[PDB]
Scaffold this active site. Structure first.
Site, PDB file in Angstrom:
ATOM      1  CG  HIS A 154      -2.170  -4.951  -8.430  1.00  0.00           C
ATOM      2  ND1 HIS A 154      -3.022  -3.919  -8.725  1.00  0.00           N
ATOM      3  CD2 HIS A 154      -1.680  -5.468  -9.586  1.00  0.00           C
ATOM      4  CE1 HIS A 154      -3.029  -3.823 -10.037  1.00  0.00           C
ATOM      5  NE2 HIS A 154      -2.236  -4.736 -10.600  1.00  0.00           N
TER       6      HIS A 154
ATOM      7  CD  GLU B 243      -3.166  -2.819  -5.143  1.00  0.00           C
ATOM      8  OE1 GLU B 243      -4.314  -3.256  -5.377  1.00  0.00           O
ATOM      9  OE2 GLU B 243      -2.353  -2.542  -6.046  1.00  0.00           O
TER      10      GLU B 243
ATOM     11  NE  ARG C  79       1.150  -2.704 -11.141  1.00  0.00           N
ATOM     12  CZ  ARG C  79       0.036  -1.992 -11.003  1.00  0.00           C
ATOM     13  NH1 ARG C  79      -0.212  -1.406  -9.839  1.00  0.00           N
ATOM     14  NH2 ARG C  79      -0.816  -1.834 -12.016  1.00  0.00           N
TER      15      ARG C  79
ATOM     16  CG  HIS D  13      -7.270  -3.505  -7.562  1.00  0.00           C
ATOM     17  ND1 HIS D  13      -6.067  -3.615  -8.204  1.00  0.00           N
ATOM     18  CD2 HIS D  13      -8.148  -4.380  -8.126  1.00  0.00           C
ATOM     19  CE1 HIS D  13      -6.229  -4.534  -9.125  1.00  0.00           C
ATOM     20  NE2 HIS D  13      -7.470  -5.027  -9.117  1.00  0.00           N
TER      21      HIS D  13
ATOM     22  CD  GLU E 275      -7.698   0.895  -7.432  1.00  0.00           C
ATOM     23  OE1 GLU E 275      -7.027   0.833  -6.385  1.00  0.00           O
ATOM     24  OE2 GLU E 275      -7.297   0.385  -8.490  1.00  0.00           O
TER      25      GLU E 275
HETATM   26  O   LIG Z   1      -4.602  -1.158  -7.831  1.00  0.00           O
HETATM   27 ZN   LIG Z   2      -4.234  -2.853  -7.581  1.00  0.00          ZN
HETATM   28 ZN   LIG Z   3      -5.482   0.184  -8.743  1.00  0.00          ZN
END
Ligand SMILES: [O-]
Ligand SMILES: [Zn+2]
Ligand SMILES: [Zn+2]
Length: 305
Positions: free
Chosen positions: A67, A70, A125, A194, A268
């Site tokens: 993504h 990020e 994203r 992420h 994350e």
């Molecule tokens: O994410």
């Molecule tokens: Zn992500």
């Molecule tokens: Zn995520």
């Protein structure tokens, strides 16, 4: 040199690509660069391979930035790459890992979107693939995998941020990883990075069914969050994706796990919402340092101690 490169600030796509060429030139005894494909727009997709020899040794896959927005993830990946070259022959534990396993690091998994966050939309994203039938661009690459594809936890609308694409692996950025990891056939851990939320998750995301290795992965996850926290007290929650965040279909670790790769985890990173995706550069190094301890703990478990 990688010695003068500034790890405490965010970089552009070309700076990161140039950093990769520098690292390979400086540490040929350990790292090499592979082009596993090209993005929708024709940008090369690169993976750095860390190895001390062998024929098809067991491996660890680590992807960052699927993504594009990020940014803390691509930044952590650059630092990780430097870290590996400094710690080999120094940290006895990491040395044992590279002495029996190869590590594959993909810093910019979605280059087209990454270039886009720098040129037009900081919060972009998805990938940059075009669908003639819609004015909307892109597919969420983390909803494109053949793991409960098209099920609840993703949208069929092209304008949605969680659009899953026409079919599983439709995105070249996804297909290139699937092909590579499958042809390789000896990956033991699959880690996808992420941001944000501060969570360490394991399968499944598409179904409420428990993975048979549930108790083991949960123990590994507890150990990893303890180690990561040790440094700056950063607290993480852990568990299966479906019970810890929400139902999500077509995710990578669900696919990697179904391919026999037991140690499949998704991180994350920082933070919990204060800055979100726009994490200040002052937190880059600290985030990279703590996440490393968490990642290493998982690796030690794969070599099996
Ligand atoms: O994410
Ligand atoms: Zn992500
Ligand atoms: Zn995520």
């Amino acid at each position: 040199s990688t010695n003068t490169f500034n790890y405490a600030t965010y970089h552009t796509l070309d700076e990161i690509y140039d950093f990769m060429d520098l690292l390979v030139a400086e540490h040929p005894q350990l790292v090499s660069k592979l082009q596993i494909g090209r993005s929708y727009e024709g940008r090369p997709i690169y993976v750095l391979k860390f190895s001390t020899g062998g024929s098809n040794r067991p491996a660890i896959w680590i992807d960052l930035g699927i993504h594009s927005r990020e940014w803390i993830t691509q930044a952590t990946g650059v630092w990780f790459a430097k870290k590996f070259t400094e710690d080999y022959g120094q940290d006895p534990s990491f040395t044992a890992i590279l002495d029996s396993m190869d590590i594959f690091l993909e810093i910019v998994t979605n280059p087209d979107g990454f270039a886009f966050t720098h040129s037009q939309n900081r919060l972009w994203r998805k990938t940059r693939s075009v669908t003639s039938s819609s004015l909307c661009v892109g597919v969420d690459a983390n909803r494109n995998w053949d793991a409960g594809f098209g099920k609840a936890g993703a949208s069929s609308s092209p304008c949605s941020e969680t659009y899953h694409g026409k079919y599983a692996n439709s995105e070249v950025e996804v297909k290139s990883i699937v092909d590579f990891v499958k042809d390789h056939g000896n990956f033991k851990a699959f880690l996808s990075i992420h941001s944000y939320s501060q969570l360490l998750l394991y399968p499944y995301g598409y179904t409420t069914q428990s993975i048979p290795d549930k108790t083991e992965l949960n123990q590994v996850a507890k150990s990893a969050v303890a180690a990561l926290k040790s440094l700056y007290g950063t607290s993480y929650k852990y568990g299966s994706i479906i019970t810890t965040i929400y139902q999500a279909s077509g995710g990578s670790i669900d696919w990697s796990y179904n391919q026999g790769i037991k140690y499949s985890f998704t991180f994350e990173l920082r933070d919990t919402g204060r800055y979100g995706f726009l994490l200040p550069a002052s937190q880059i190094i600290p985030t990279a340092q703590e996440t490393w301890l968490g990642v290493l703990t998982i690796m030690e478990h794969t070599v099996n101690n």
